[PDB]
Design a protein around this ligand. Structure first.
Ligand SMILES: NC(=O)c1ccc[n+]([C@@H]2O[C@H](COP(=O)([O-])OP(=O)(O)OC[C@H]3O[C@@H](n4cnc5c(N)ncnc54)[C@H](O)[C@@H]3O)[C@@H](O)[C@H]2O)c1
Ligand SMILES: NC(=O)c1ccc[n+]([C@@H]2O[C@H](COP(=O)([O-])OP(=O)(O)OC[C@H]3O[C@@H](n4cnc5c(N)ncnc54)[C@H](O)[C@@H]3O)[C@@H](O)[C@H]2O)c1
Ligand SMILES: COc1ccc(-c2cn3cc(-c4cc(OC)cc(OC)c4)ccc3n2)cc1
Ligand SMILES: COc1ccc(-c2cn3cc(-c4cc(OC)cc(OC)c4)ccc3n2)cc1
Lengths: 479, 485
C-alpha cells in the first residue's frame, strides 16, 4: 500500500554514492501527480567513476573473471531468487514510478524479469566456440570471450524488464556493466542494485548511475572505456547513440526502437481472437509499448464486422486507479506526447477518416478509426497512445507490400486459419517477430529485435549471446 | 602476360556497362612504372542512386534472384569461382599493375585466396540454418535467417580483389544484392570481376559496381537510405566516418575491419629461425602494406640480440624490384602520400633514439621503392611503435615477463591480430587467452583460412569475415511464433 522508497543513490562497487555535484532530480508518480522521492543526479564524473569500477572488476584475475563458468549462473539464479522474493515490492515501485496497473507490473514485468534471468543462467556454461577443420598440421579454434564494460540505457515503459533483458545475457557471458535507467523511472533499477550486492556479485560488476539522457546517457555513449552499448527507446535518440559510439571508442552498439508495427486480418480468421488480440496490441500498458499496433489491415470480406466488433470492445475496458484490482489501463507518463496524440486524432478527421468511437480525454478514452488509408498521418506515424487505424485490402500480395512499405519493422501479427496464408505471410513480412493468432507472445528463448529502422541486434534468445561476446580465433601450427 | 590491355573501365549496373552520369573520368596508375594505366569512369551520388535502385529491384520479392533455389545460388557462386580460376592470370596481372604486388604473390596468395573464399561460401548457401525453439505446449516457434537486402561494400588498395571477395561471397550466398565501390587507387580488378559476374550468369542487378572516390561514391553509399548493410575495410579514420553516416540516416547495419598495432611476441623458447622468418615476412609482406602487418615485435631479453642480428641479414637478403620479375619479394609502395608518410616515420625513429640496424632510407629515386628497414632498442612511447606504418619497418622491443608483455600488447586501442612464438604449452595458451586480439596465431604468421573468422577487437573492427560467423553479418533474424487452438 504505502511503501517507502529505500534506495535513491548512485550504485558503484556495491556501495551507495552521491553525485560528484550533489545535484538531485525528483521522480514523480503519473497516477497521482506527486513527487515520490529525490534521486541523485549523476553525470560525467559519476559515470567516469563507475566505468573505472567496471574496468577493475572486469580486469584479468578479478574475482569476477576467475569465477567458474557455472558459478556465474549460480549468481544469476541467486539474483532471480531474490527478485522472486521481493517481487511485489518491485511491482509496487514499478507501479508508483510508471503508473502501470499493479498487477500488470506483478504478473508481466516481474514474471518476465524472473524468467529472463533464469533462462540466461542456463547459458553461462554453454557458450561454445567452434573448433575449425583447416589443414593437416594446424589446430584452429575460436573462443567467445566477453566484450568488457557494457553500457545499458533503457525507456520508462518497461524499466526493470528492459533493464534485465540486457543485464541477464551480459553477466552470464561475463562482462561488467554501467547501467543508466530512465529519469522518469529510476526506482526499480536502483532497488535491483541492492539485490545484486545481496546475491553477492563481486563489487564493480554492475554499476547504476541514474540521471538524464543528454547528461548521463550521453556520457556513456561517448566514453572511451565502455566497449559495448545496449539501448532501448526512441528511434531518433538511438541514432545519436550510434553516432557517438562511432565518433569515440568505436564501441559495439545494439538498438531496439519503435515502429509502425502492422496487424493483418484475413477473411477466414477467427474474428473474436483477431479483434481481441488487435485490442491487446493497441491499448495495453496505455498504448505506449514497443509492440503497439500502428496499423491494422483487414480484408474486405470481414471489414465492417471487424470495425463493428472493435468499437464494442473499446468502451467496456475499465480505467481508473493503477492499484485497482479491477482496472486494465492507468495513465500516461509524460504529457509531452499527450498533446501530439489527441492532435493526431484530428489528423484522420482532417484527411477523411470515420471515427467510430472515442477521441478525447477524461488519460484518453480509447479511439477507433475506420476508412483509413495509407497516406493519412494516422497510418504514417507511430502513436504512443490508443489509436486503432483500420485499413482494408483485397490481396495477400497487396497487404504484403503495404505493410512492408515503412522503414520500421519490429512486429507483425497475422490472423488466419489457413496454412498457406499463415506461412506465405510470415516469410514475406519484414518484421523482427511475426506473431500468428496471438499478440505480445514474448518468450525468454525467442529473439526479439528490429528489422530496418526498428534497431539492430537481437535480445532474449540464444541469439542475444552474440551481442555480448567478441569472437577470438586461435590458429596454431605444428611442426 | 606483359603488354595486356585493360578491357574494363566502365560502371557495372544491371550487368550493363555505363558512363558517369556526370561524364568525368579519373586515372589509375601503375606504381611500379610511375605511369598511367588508363582512365575509369568517376561515379557520384547520381551513379550510386542508379545502382542502388538496380540492386533494390534485383532483391525485390519474386525477382529471378529471390525466387531462385537455395542450392542454385550456391551453384552460381561455384560457377563464378570457376571463371576466376580460368581468368586467373589476367586478374593477377591487373592486380600487380594496379598495386605493385609481386605478380607471383598475387597469383598464389591473392587470387588463390579469392577462389577458396568463393567456394567455402558457395558451400554455405543451402546450409544457412535457423532454429526451432521449445516454448509452451501449444506454440510452434522458430527463427528464419532472412537476407538483409542491398549491401554496400567499400574496400582499400592493399588487397583490392580479395577484400572485395571476402564480402561478396557471404553476402551473395545469403541472398542479398550488392553495390560495390573499390578504392580509387586500385579499381581495375573489381571491374574485371564484374565482367565474370555476368558471364557466370548472375541475374542483372544482383551485383553493381560504381568506381570513384571516397567522399563522393563512398559516402553516397554509406548514407544512402535504401542500402541496408555496409561492409568497410579501410582506415580507422574513414571507419568512424562511415559508421557515423550509417547511423545518421537509415540506421544501416555496419561491419568494419581497419588495421592494428599488431603485436608479434617472440618468447625465449622459440624456434628462432622460424620466428625471424615469420616475423620477417609478417612485417614485410606485400611491401609491409597489409591489414595484418607486424608492427611492435616483442622479444625476450634472453634472445633479444641474436634475434635482431638474425633479422637484419634477412632484411638485406630479401629482393626488391620489378613486380613482374619472378625473383621479387617487395614491389613499390602504393602512392606519393604513403611513400612520403612512411619515409617521415623513419626519421621520427632516428630522431626518437632507436638503433637503425639496417636500411633507413629510400633507394633508386626514380622508383617508388624503400630500403627494407629494421630498428633496435625501440621503447614504447616512440613513434614507430605507436602508429601503423603501412610499410617495411621492423621495430623490435625488449620484454621480461609474460605478464609484462600481456599488459604491454593490450595497451593500444587496436587489436586485429597477434602472433606468439614459443614451444611452451602453458605460455602459448596463457598468451593466447589473455591477448586482446582478433586472431592470435601461434608458431606461424598470416594463417588465414576461409573457415576461420577474421576481424578486430576494440577499435580495430566490429563483426567478423571469412567464417560461419560471416553469415551473421549478412542475414537478419526473424522470429515466427504460432499459437494453436
Ligand atoms: N517532442 C517530440 O516531437 C516527441 C514526440 C513524441 C515522442 N517523443 C519522444 O518520446 C520519448 C519518450 O521517452 P523514451 O525513454 O521512451 O525514449 P527516449 O529516446 O527518450 O529514451 C531515451 C533513454 O536513453 C536516455 N537518453 C535520452 N536522451 C539521450 C541522448 N541524447 N543520448 C543518450 N541517451 C539518451 C534516457 O535517459 C532514456 O534512458 C522522448 O524521449 C521523446 O524523444 C518526442
Ligand atoms: N587521390 C587521393 O585522394 C588518394 C590517393 C592515394 C592515397 N590516398 C589516401 O591514402 C590512404 C590509404 O587508405 P586506405 O585505402 O588503406 O583506406 P581508406 O580508409 O583511406 O579508404 C578505404 C576506402 O574507403 C573509401 N572512402 C574513403 N574515404 C571515404 C569517406 N569519407 N566516406 C566513405 N568512403 C570513403 C575509399 O574509396 C577507399 O577505398 C587514405 O588516407 C587515402 O585516402 C588518397
Ligand atoms: C490474456 O491473459 C494473459 C495473461 C498473461 C499472459 C502472459 C504474458 N506473459 C509474458 C511474460 C513475459 C516474459 C518476457 O520476457 C521473457 C516478456 C514479456 O512481454 C509480453 C512477457 C511472462 C508471463 C506472461 N503471461 C498472456 C495472456
Ligand atoms: C610455406 O608453406 C606454406 C603453407 C601454406 C601457405 C599458404 C597460406 N595461404 C593463405 C592464403 C590466403 C587466403 C586468404 O583468404 C582465404 C587470405 C590470405 O592473406 C594473407 C591468404 C592463400 C594461400 C596460402 N598458402 C603458404 C605457405
Amino acid at each position: 500500500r504505502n511503501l517507502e522508497v529505500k534506495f535513491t543513490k548512485i550504485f558503484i562497487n556495491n556501495e551507495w554514492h552521491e553525485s560528484k555535484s550533489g545535484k538531485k532530480f525528483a521522480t514523480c508518480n503519473p497516477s497521482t501527480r506527486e513527487q515520490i522521492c529525490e534521486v541523485e543526479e549523476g553525470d560525467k564524473p559519476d559515470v567516469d567513476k563507475a566505468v573505472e569500477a567496471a574496468q577493475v572488476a572486469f580486469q584479468r584475475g578479478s574475482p569476477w573473471r576467475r569465477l567458474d563458468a557455472l558459478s556465474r549462473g549460480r549468481l544469476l539464479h541467486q539474483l532471480a531468487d531474490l527478485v522472486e522474493r521481493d517481487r511485489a515490492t518491485l511491482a509496487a515501485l514499478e507501479t508508483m514510478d510508471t503508473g502501470k496497473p499493479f498487477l500488470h507490473a506483478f504478473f508481466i514485468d516481474l514474471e518476465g524479469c524472473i524468467r529472463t534471468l533464469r533462462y540466461f543462467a542456463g547459458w553461462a556454461d554453454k557458450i561454445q566456440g567452434k573448433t575449425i577443420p583447416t589443414d593437416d598440421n594446424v589446430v584452429c579454434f575460436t573462443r567467445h570471450e566477453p566484450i568488457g564494460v557494457c553500457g545499458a540505457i533503457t525507456p520508462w515503459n518497461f524499466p526493470l524488464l528492459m533493464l534485465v533483458w540486457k543485464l541477464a545475457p551480459a553477466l552470464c557471458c561475463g562482462n561488467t556493466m554501467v547501467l543508466k535507467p530512465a529519469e522518469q523511472t529510476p526506482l526499480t533499477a536502483l532497488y535491483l542494485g541492492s539485490l545484486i550486492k545481496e546475491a553477492g556479485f563481486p563489487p564493480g560488476v554492475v554499476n547504476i548511475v541514474p540521471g538524464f539522457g543528454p547528461t548521463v546517457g550521453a556520457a556513456i555513449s561517448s566514453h572511451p572505456q565502455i566497449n559495448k552499448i545496449a539501448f532501448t527507446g526512441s528511434t531518433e535518440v538511438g541514432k545519436l547513440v550510434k553516432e557517438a559510439a562511432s565518433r569515440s571508442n568505436l564501441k559495439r552498439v545494439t538498438l531496439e526502437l519503435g515502429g509502425k508495427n502492422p496487424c493483418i486480418v484475413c477473411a477466414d480468421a477467427d474474428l473474436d481472437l483477431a479483434v481481441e488480440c488487435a485490442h491487446q496490441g493497441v491499448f495495453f500498458n496505455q498504448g505506449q509499448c514497443c509492440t503497439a499496433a500502428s496499423r491494422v489491415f483487414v480484408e474486405e470480406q470481414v471489414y465492417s464486422e471487424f470495425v463493428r466488433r472493435s468499437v464494442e470492445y473499446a468502451k467496456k475496458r475499465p480505467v481508473g486507479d493503477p492499484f485497482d484490482v479491477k482496472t486494465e489501463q492507468g495513465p500516461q507518463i509524460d504529457q509531452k506526447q499527450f498533446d501530439k496524440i489527441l492532435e493526431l486524432i484530428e489528423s484522420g478527421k482532417k484527411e477523411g477518416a470515420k471515427l467510430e468511437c472515442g477521441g478525447s480525454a477524461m488519460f484518453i478514452k480509447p479511439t477507433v478509426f475506420s476508412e483509413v488509408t495509407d497516406n493519412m498521418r494516422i497510418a504514417k506515424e507511430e502513436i504512443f497512445g490508443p489509436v486503432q487505424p483500420i485499413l482494408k485490402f483485397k490481396s495477400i500480395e497487396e497487404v504484403i507490400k503495404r505493410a512492408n512499405s515503412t522503414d520500421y519493422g519490429l512486429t507483425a501479427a497475422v490472423f488466419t486459419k489457413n496454412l498457406d496464408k499463415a506461412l506465405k505471410l510470415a516469410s514475406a513480412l519484414e518484421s523482427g517477430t511475426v506473431w500468428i493468432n496471438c499478440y505480445n507472445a514474448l518468450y525468454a528463448q525467442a529473439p526479439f529485435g528490429g528489422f530496418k529502422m526498428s534497431g539492430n541486434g537481437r535480445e532474449l534468445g540464444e541469439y542475444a549471446l552474440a551481442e555480448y561476446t567478441e569472437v577470438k580465433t586461435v590458429t596454431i601450427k605444428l611442426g
